[PDB]
Amino acid sequence: EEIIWESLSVDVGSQGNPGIVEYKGVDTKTGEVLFEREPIPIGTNNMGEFLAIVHGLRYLKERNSRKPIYSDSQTAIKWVKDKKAKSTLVRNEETALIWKLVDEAEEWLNTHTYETPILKWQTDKWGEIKADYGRA
RNA sequence: ACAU
DNA sequence: CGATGT
Ligand SMILES: [Cl-]
Ligand SMILES: [Cl-]
Ligand SMILES: [Cl-]
Ligand SMILES: [Mg+2]
Ligand SMILES: [Mg+2]
Ligand SMILES: [Rb+]
Ligand SMILES: [Rb+]
Ligand SMILES: [Rb+]
Ligand SMILES: [Rb+]
Ligand SMILES: [Rb+]
Ligand SMILES: [Rb+]
C-alpha cells in the first residue's frame, strides 16, 4: 500500500450519468494536467473511465514511457484487461459519438501492444485520485 | 457486497 | 436520493 508517485492518474467527470462525459490524465506526483478530452454530449461513467485509461496507454506509448496508470474504476480496469467495454448504454443517434470512441479504443487495444501496469487507486487508504473532478 |  | 458496472 505505497503510492507509486512516478505514474499517470486518470478520471472521468460527468454531468449526469448517463450524461455529459469528459476525462483527464494528470501526473500523480505534481497534479499537472497532461491531457483532457473535450466533453462528449452523452455517455456513462464507465465508458469515460475506460476511454481515460486507453487514452493514457496511447499517451504513454507515444512518449516511450513505462510509467503505470492509476484508475479508481474497478469496471474500467477490467474492461481494458478484457479489451472489451461491456456497456449497457443504448446505441442510437444520441449516443453515436461515445460509442464511436469506445469502438475505436477497443480497436486500438486489439492492434497495439503495451506493458503499462494498470493499477487500482486505493481511495479508501489514499483519498481521492489526483485526476478527480471535485464533483462527487 | 465491491468500485465508481 | 438517482445512475453505471462486476
Ligand atoms: Cl477517447
Ligand atoms: Cl508498477
Ligand atoms: Cl480493480
Ligand atoms: Mg473515477
Ligand atoms: Mg472522480
Ligand atoms: Rb512507441
Ligand atoms: Rb468528483
Ligand atoms: Rb469526487
Ligand atoms: Rb471514487
Ligand atoms: Rb455509493
Ligand atoms: Rb448497484
Side-chain angles (χ1 to χ4, degrees), chain A residues 105-128:
Chain A
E106 292 175 345
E107 192 62 30
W108 189 89
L109 291 172
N110 288 326
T111 50
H112 296 76
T113 65
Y114 46 89
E115 301 191 353
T116 306
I118 299 170
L119 305 181
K120 180 69 171 71
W121 181 263
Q122 293 182 56
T123 306
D124 60 334
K125 304 169 184 177
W126 302 338
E128 211 75 21

PDB file of all heavy atoms in Angstrom, chain A residues 105-128:
ATOM      1  N   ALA A 105     -11.403   2.791 -29.309  1.00  0.00           N
ATOM      2  CA  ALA A 105     -10.463   2.461 -28.246  1.00  0.00           C
ATOM      3  C   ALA A 105     -10.238   0.962 -28.180  1.00  0.00           C
ATOM      4  O   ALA A 105      -9.093   0.506 -28.055  1.00  0.00           O
ATOM      5  CB  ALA A 105     -10.966   2.997 -26.911  1.00  0.00           C
ATOM      6  N   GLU A 106     -11.313   0.175 -28.281  1.00  0.00           N
ATOM      7  CA  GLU A 106     -11.163  -1.275 -28.389  1.00  0.00           C
ATOM      8  C   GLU A 106     -10.302  -1.637 -29.587  1.00  0.00           C
ATOM      9  O   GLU A 106      -9.424  -2.504 -29.499  1.00  0.00           O
ATOM     10  CB  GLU A 106     -12.532  -1.949 -28.499  1.00  0.00           C
ATOM     11  CG  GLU A 106     -13.365  -1.854 -27.233  1.00  0.00           C
ATOM     12  CD  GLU A 106     -14.763  -2.416 -27.414  1.00  0.00           C
ATOM     13  OE1 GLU A 106     -15.187  -2.622 -28.573  1.00  0.00           O
ATOM     14  OE2 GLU A 106     -15.442  -2.648 -26.395  1.00  0.00           O
ATOM     15  N   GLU A 107     -10.553  -0.997 -30.728  1.00  0.00           N
ATOM     16  CA  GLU A 107      -9.770  -1.279 -31.922  1.00  0.00           C
ATOM     17  C   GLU A 107      -8.287  -1.038 -31.675  1.00  0.00           C
ATOM     18  O   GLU A 107      -7.448  -1.859 -32.048  1.00  0.00           O
ATOM     19  CB  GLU A 107     -10.273  -0.443 -33.103  1.00  0.00           C
ATOM     20  CG  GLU A 107      -9.717  -0.881 -34.416  1.00  0.00           C
ATOM     21  CD  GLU A 107     -10.119  -2.318 -34.768  1.00  0.00           C
ATOM     22  OE1 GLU A 107     -11.213  -2.746 -34.327  1.00  0.00           O
ATOM     23  OE2 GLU A 107      -9.335  -3.003 -35.445  1.00  0.00           O
ATOM     24  N   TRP A 108      -7.948   0.088 -31.046  1.00  0.00           N
ATOM     25  CA  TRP A 108      -6.551   0.365 -30.720  1.00  0.00           C
ATOM     26  C   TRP A 108      -5.965  -0.730 -29.835  1.00  0.00           C
ATOM     27  O   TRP A 108      -4.853  -1.216 -30.084  1.00  0.00           O
ATOM     28  CB  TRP A 108      -6.419   1.731 -30.038  1.00  0.00           C
ATOM     29  CG  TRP A 108      -4.985   2.119 -29.887  1.00  0.00           C
ATOM     30  CD1 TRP A 108      -4.232   2.804 -30.787  1.00  0.00           C
ATOM     31  CD2 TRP A 108      -4.106   1.812 -28.779  1.00  0.00           C
ATOM     32  NE1 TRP A 108      -2.950   2.960 -30.317  1.00  0.00           N
ATOM     33  CE2 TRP A 108      -2.843   2.345 -29.099  1.00  0.00           C
ATOM     34  CE3 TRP A 108      -4.268   1.139 -27.570  1.00  0.00           C
ATOM     35  CZ2 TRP A 108      -1.754   2.251 -28.238  1.00  0.00           C
ATOM     36  CZ3 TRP A 108      -3.169   1.041 -26.707  1.00  0.00           C
ATOM     37  CH2 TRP A 108      -1.935   1.584 -27.059  1.00  0.00           C
ATOM     38  N   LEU A 109      -6.692  -1.132 -28.797  1.00  0.00           N
ATOM     39  CA  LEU A 109      -6.182  -2.175 -27.909  1.00  0.00           C
ATOM     40  C   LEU A 109      -5.897  -3.465 -28.662  1.00  0.00           C
ATOM     41  O   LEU A 109      -4.979  -4.212 -28.295  1.00  0.00           O
ATOM     42  CB  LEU A 109      -7.187  -2.464 -26.796  1.00  0.00           C
ATOM     43  CG  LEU A 109      -7.392  -1.370 -25.762  1.00  0.00           C
ATOM     44  CD1 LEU A 109      -8.549  -1.753 -24.866  1.00  0.00           C
ATOM     45  CD2 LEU A 109      -6.132  -1.137 -24.923  1.00  0.00           C
ATOM     46  N   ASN A 110      -6.689  -3.766 -29.687  1.00  0.00           N
ATOM     47  CA  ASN A 110      -6.536  -5.003 -30.443  1.00  0.00           C
ATOM     48  C   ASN A 110      -5.448  -4.937 -31.502  1.00  0.00           C
ATOM     49  O   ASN A 110      -5.152  -5.972 -32.111  1.00  0.00           O
ATOM     50  CB  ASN A 110      -7.858  -5.378 -31.110  1.00  0.00           C
ATOM     51  CG  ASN A 110      -8.893  -5.878 -30.113  1.00  0.00           C
ATOM     52  OD1 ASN A 110      -8.547  -6.520 -29.122  1.00  0.00           O
ATOM     53  ND2 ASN A 110     -10.164  -5.614 -30.390  1.00  0.00           N
ATOM     54  N   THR A 111      -4.871  -3.763 -31.758  1.00  0.00           N
ATOM     55  CA  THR A 111      -3.874  -3.610 -32.801  1.00  0.00           C
ATOM     56  C   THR A 111      -2.540  -3.098 -32.274  1.00  0.00           C
ATOM     57  O   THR A 111      -1.622  -2.884 -33.075  1.00  0.00           O
ATOM     58  CB  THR A 111      -4.396  -2.688 -33.916  1.00  0.00           C
ATOM     59  OG1 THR A 111      -4.923  -1.490 -33.352  1.00  0.00           O
ATOM     60  CG2 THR A 111      -5.499  -3.359 -34.711  1.00  0.00           C
ATOM     61  N   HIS A 112      -2.389  -2.935 -30.962  1.00  0.00           N
ATOM     62  CA  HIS A 112      -1.169  -2.392 -30.381  1.00  0.00           C
ATOM     63  C   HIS A 112      -0.798  -3.181 -29.144  1.00  0.00           C
ATOM     64  O   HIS A 112      -1.631  -3.849 -28.531  1.00  0.00           O
ATOM     65  CB  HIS A 112      -1.316  -0.899 -30.057  1.00  0.00           C
ATOM     66  CG  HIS A 112      -1.528  -0.070 -31.266  1.00  0.00           C
ATOM     67  ND1 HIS A 112      -2.740  -0.019 -31.924  1.00  0.00           N
ATOM     68  CD2 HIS A 112      -0.666   0.661 -32.008  1.00  0.00           C
ATOM     69  CE1 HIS A 112      -2.621   0.739 -32.997  1.00  0.00           C
ATOM     70  NE2 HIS A 112      -1.370   1.153 -33.078  1.00  0.00           N
ATOM     71  N   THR A 113       0.480  -3.115 -28.798  1.00  0.00           N
ATOM     72  CA  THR A 113       0.979  -3.759 -27.597  1.00  0.00           C
ATOM     73  C   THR A 113       1.384  -2.702 -26.579  1.00  0.00           C
ATOM     74  O   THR A 113       1.652  -1.544 -26.912  1.00  0.00           O
ATOM     75  CB  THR A 113       2.178  -4.650 -27.923  1.00  0.00           C
ATOM     76  OG1 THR A 113       3.259  -3.835 -28.388  1.00  0.00           O
ATOM     77  CG2 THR A 113       1.799  -5.661 -28.999  1.00  0.00           C
ATOM     78  N   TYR A 114       1.433  -3.119 -25.317  1.00  0.00           N
ATOM     79  CA  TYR A 114       1.843  -2.228 -24.240  1.00  0.00           C
ATOM     80  C   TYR A 114       2.160  -3.082 -23.023  1.00  0.00           C
ATOM     81  O   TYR A 114       1.638  -4.188 -22.869  1.00  0.00           O
ATOM     82  CB  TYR A 114       0.758  -1.191 -23.927  1.00  0.00           C
ATOM     83  CG  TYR A 114      -0.616  -1.798 -23.831  1.00  0.00           C
ATOM     84  CD1 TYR A 114      -1.098  -2.289 -22.622  1.00  0.00           C
ATOM     85  CD2 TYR A 114      -1.426  -1.912 -24.955  1.00  0.00           C
ATOM     86  CE1 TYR A 114      -2.360  -2.870 -22.532  1.00  0.00           C
ATOM     87  CE2 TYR A 114      -2.684  -2.489 -24.873  1.00  0.00           C
ATOM     88  CZ  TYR A 114      -3.146  -2.962 -23.660  1.00  0.00           C
ATOM     89  OH  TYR A 114      -4.392  -3.534 -23.585  1.00  0.00           O
ATOM     90  N   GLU A 115       3.054  -2.574 -22.184  1.00  0.00           N
ATOM     91  CA  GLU A 115       3.420  -3.240 -20.945  1.00  0.00           C
ATOM     92  C   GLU A 115       2.948  -2.464 -19.724  1.00  0.00           C
ATOM     93  O   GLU A 115       3.165  -2.918 -18.598  1.00  0.00           O
ATOM     94  CB  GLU A 115       4.937  -3.458 -20.888  1.00  0.00           C
ATOM     95  CG  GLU A 115       5.455  -4.302 -22.047  1.00  0.00           C
ATOM     96  CD  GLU A 115       6.894  -4.744 -21.879  1.00  0.00           C
ATOM     97  OE1 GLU A 115       7.557  -4.293 -20.923  1.00  0.00           O
ATOM     98  OE2 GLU A 115       7.364  -5.551 -22.709  1.00  0.00           O
ATOM     99  N   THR A 116       2.298  -1.322 -19.929  1.00  0.00           N
ATOM    100  CA  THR A 116       1.881  -0.418 -18.865  1.00  0.00           C
ATOM    101  C   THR A 116       1.080  -1.166 -17.808  1.00  0.00           C
ATOM    102  O   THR A 116       0.005  -1.706 -18.127  1.00  0.00           O
ATOM    103  CB  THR A 116       0.965   0.624 -19.483  1.00  0.00           C
ATOM    104  OG1 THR A 116       1.642   1.244 -20.583  1.00  0.00           O
ATOM    105  CG2 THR A 116       0.526   1.650 -18.432  1.00  0.00           C
ATOM    106  N   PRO A 117       1.533  -1.192 -16.556  1.00  0.00           N
ATOM    107  CA  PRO A 117       0.672  -1.698 -15.473  1.00  0.00           C
ATOM    108  C   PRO A 117      -0.508  -0.765 -15.264  1.00  0.00           C
ATOM    109  O   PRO A 117      -0.359   0.455 -15.230  1.00  0.00           O
ATOM    110  CB  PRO A 117       1.601  -1.673 -14.253  1.00  0.00           C
ATOM    111  CG  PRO A 117       3.025  -1.658 -14.821  1.00  0.00           C
ATOM    112  CD  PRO A 117       2.876  -0.837 -16.078  1.00  0.00           C
ATOM    113  N   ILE A 118      -1.691  -1.347 -15.131  1.00  0.00           N
ATOM    114  CA  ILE A 118      -2.905  -0.588 -14.847  1.00  0.00           C
ATOM    115  C   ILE A 118      -3.332  -0.951 -13.429  1.00  0.00           C
ATOM    116  O   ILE A 118      -3.729  -2.090 -13.157  1.00  0.00           O
ATOM    117  CB  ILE A 118      -4.005  -0.844 -15.886  1.00  0.00           C
ATOM    118  CG1 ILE A 118      -3.520  -0.418 -17.280  1.00  0.00           C
ATOM    119  CG2 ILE A 118      -5.276  -0.086 -15.512  1.00  0.00           C
ATOM    120  CD1 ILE A 118      -4.401  -0.839 -18.383  1.00  0.00           C
ATOM    121  N   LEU A 119      -3.200   0.026 -12.525  1.00  0.00           N
ATOM    122  CA  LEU A 119      -3.268  -0.171 -11.084  1.00  0.00           C
ATOM    123  C   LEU A 119      -4.520   0.468 -10.498  1.00  0.00           C
ATOM    124  O   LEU A 119      -4.949   1.540 -10.933  1.00  0.00           O
ATOM    125  CB  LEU A 119      -2.060   0.491 -10.436  1.00  0.00           C
ATOM    126  CG  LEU A 119      -0.699   0.036 -10.972  1.00  0.00           C
ATOM    127  CD1 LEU A 119       0.385   0.762 -10.229  1.00  0.00           C
ATOM    128  CD2 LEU A 119      -0.519  -1.476 -10.875  1.00  0.00           C
ATOM    129  N   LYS A 120      -5.094  -0.193  -9.506  1.00  0.00           N
ATOM    130  CA  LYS A 120      -6.210   0.369  -8.751  1.00  0.00           C
ATOM    131  C   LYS A 120      -5.726   1.459  -7.799  1.00  0.00           C
ATOM    132  O   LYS A 120      -4.868   1.226  -6.937  1.00  0.00           O
ATOM    133  CB  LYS A 120      -6.915  -0.731  -7.969  1.00  0.00           C
ATOM    134  CG  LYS A 120      -8.117  -0.221  -7.152  1.00  0.00           C
ATOM    135  CD  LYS A 120      -9.266   0.210  -8.083  1.00  0.00           C
ATOM    136  CE  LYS A 120     -10.540   0.509  -7.302  1.00  0.00           C
ATOM    137  NZ  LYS A 120     -10.424   1.770  -6.513  1.00  0.00           N
ATOM    138  N   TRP A 121      -6.299   2.647  -7.937  1.00  0.00           N
ATOM    139  CA  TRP A 121      -6.097   3.696  -6.949  1.00  0.00           C
ATOM    140  C   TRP A 121      -6.904   3.358  -5.693  1.00  0.00           C
ATOM    141  O   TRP A 121      -8.128   3.196  -5.753  1.00  0.00           O
ATOM    142  CB  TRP A 121      -6.522   5.052  -7.518  1.00  0.00           C
ATOM    143  CG  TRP A 121      -6.285   6.133  -6.517  1.00  0.00           C
ATOM    144  CD1 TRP A 121      -7.205   6.668  -5.658  1.00  0.00           C
ATOM    145  CD2 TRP A 121      -5.037   6.760  -6.216  1.00  0.00           C
ATOM    146  NE1 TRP A 121      -6.604   7.608  -4.866  1.00  0.00           N
ATOM    147  CE2 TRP A 121      -5.277   7.695  -5.195  1.00  0.00           C
ATOM    148  CE3 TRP A 121      -3.746   6.656  -6.748  1.00  0.00           C
ATOM    149  CZ2 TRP A 121      -4.266   8.493  -4.660  1.00  0.00           C
ATOM    150  CZ3 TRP A 121      -2.739   7.458  -6.219  1.00  0.00           C
ATOM    151  CH2 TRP A 121      -3.005   8.365  -5.191  1.00  0.00           C
ATOM    152  N   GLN A 122      -6.219   3.262  -4.550  1.00  0.00           N
ATOM    153  CA  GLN A 122      -6.843   2.802  -3.305  1.00  0.00           C
ATOM    154  C   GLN A 122      -7.424   3.998  -2.562  1.00  0.00           C
ATOM    155  O   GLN A 122      -6.865   4.514  -1.591  1.00  0.00           O
ATOM    156  CB  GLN A 122      -5.841   2.005  -2.474  1.00  0.00           C
ATOM    157  CG  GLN A 122      -5.461   0.694  -3.146  1.00  0.00           C
ATOM    158  CD  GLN A 122      -4.504  -0.150  -2.332  1.00  0.00           C
ATOM    159  OE1 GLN A 122      -4.775  -0.479  -1.179  1.00  0.00           O
ATOM    160  NE2 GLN A 122      -3.378  -0.516  -2.938  1.00  0.00           N
ATOM    161  N   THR A 123      -8.610   4.409  -3.019  1.00  0.00           N
ATOM    162  CA  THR A 123      -9.272   5.586  -2.474  1.00  0.00           C
ATOM    163  C   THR A 123      -9.492   5.454  -0.973  1.00  0.00           C
ATOM    164  O   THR A 123      -9.365   6.437  -0.230  1.00  0.00           O
ATOM    165  CB  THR A 123     -10.605   5.778  -3.199  1.00  0.00           C
ATOM    166  OG1 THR A 123     -10.377   5.827  -4.622  1.00  0.00           O
ATOM    167  CG2 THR A 123     -11.301   7.050  -2.745  1.00  0.00           C
ATOM    168  N   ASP A 124      -9.810   4.245  -0.502  1.00  0.00           N
ATOM    169  CA  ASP A 124     -10.120   4.063   0.912  1.00  0.00           C
ATOM    170  C   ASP A 124      -8.916   4.348   1.798  1.00  0.00           C
ATOM    171  O   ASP A 124      -9.080   4.725   2.962  1.00  0.00           O
ATOM    172  CB  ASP A 124     -10.696   2.660   1.162  1.00  0.00           C
ATOM    173  CG  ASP A 124      -9.744   1.528   0.769  1.00  0.00           C
ATOM    174  OD1 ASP A 124      -8.884   1.716  -0.113  1.00  0.00           O
ATOM    175  OD2 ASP A 124      -9.879   0.423   1.344  1.00  0.00           O
ATOM    176  N   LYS A 125      -7.707   4.192   1.270  1.00  0.00           N
ATOM    177  CA  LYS A 125      -6.490   4.436   2.039  1.00  0.00           C
ATOM    178  C   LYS A 125      -5.814   5.759   1.703  1.00  0.00           C
ATOM    179  O   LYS A 125      -5.128   6.325   2.558  1.00  0.00           O
ATOM    180  CB  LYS A 125      -5.484   3.304   1.791  1.00  0.00           C
ATOM    181  CG  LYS A 125      -6.019   1.914   2.090  1.00  0.00           C
ATOM    182  CD  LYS A 125      -5.075   0.854   1.559  1.00  0.00           C
ATOM    183  CE  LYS A 125      -5.616  -0.555   1.755  1.00  0.00           C
ATOM    184  NZ  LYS A 125      -4.710  -1.577   1.155  1.00  0.00           N
ATOM    185  N   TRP A 126      -5.998   6.271   0.487  1.00  0.00           N
ATOM    186  CA  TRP A 126      -5.174   7.354  -0.038  1.00  0.00           C
ATOM    187  C   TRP A 126      -5.954   8.620  -0.342  1.00  0.00           C
ATOM    188  O   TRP A 126      -5.341   9.634  -0.689  1.00  0.00           O
ATOM    189  CB  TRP A 126      -4.462   6.913  -1.328  1.00  0.00           C
ATOM    190  CG  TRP A 126      -3.592   5.710  -1.191  1.00  0.00           C
ATOM    191  CD1 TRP A 126      -3.025   5.222  -0.043  1.00  0.00           C
ATOM    192  CD2 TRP A 126      -3.188   4.838  -2.241  1.00  0.00           C
ATOM    193  NE1 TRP A 126      -2.292   4.090  -0.325  1.00  0.00           N
ATOM    194  CE2 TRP A 126      -2.380   3.836  -1.669  1.00  0.00           C
ATOM    195  CE3 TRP A 126      -3.429   4.809  -3.620  1.00  0.00           C
ATOM    196  CZ2 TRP A 126      -1.810   2.815  -2.429  1.00  0.00           C
ATOM    197  CZ3 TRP A 126      -2.862   3.789  -4.378  1.00  0.00           C
ATOM    198  CH2 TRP A 126      -2.065   2.809  -3.780  1.00  0.00           C
ATOM    199  N   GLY A 127      -7.269   8.603  -0.231  1.00  0.00           N
ATOM    200  CA  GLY A 127      -8.047   9.750  -0.633  1.00  0.00           C
ATOM    201  C   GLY A 127      -8.358   9.705  -2.108  1.00  0.00           C
ATOM    202  O   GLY A 127      -8.029   8.756  -2.826  1.00  0.00           O
ATOM    203  N   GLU A 128      -8.986  10.778  -2.578  1.00  0.00           N
ATOM    204  CA  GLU A 128      -9.455  10.797  -3.956  1.00  0.00           C
ATOM    205  C   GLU A 128      -8.281  10.854  -4.941  1.00  0.00           C
ATOM    206  O   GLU A 128      -7.234  11.456  -4.673  1.00  0.00           O
ATOM    207  CB  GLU A 128     -10.411  11.971  -4.173  1.00  0.00           C
ATOM    208  CG  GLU A 128     -11.494  11.718  -5.238  1.00  0.00           C
ATOM    209  CD  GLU A 128     -12.617  10.781  -4.769  1.00  0.00           C
ATOM    210  OE1 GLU A 128     -12.819  10.630  -3.546  1.00  0.00           O
ATOM    211  OE2 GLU A 128     -13.309  10.192  -5.629  1.00  0.00           O
TER     212      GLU A 128
END
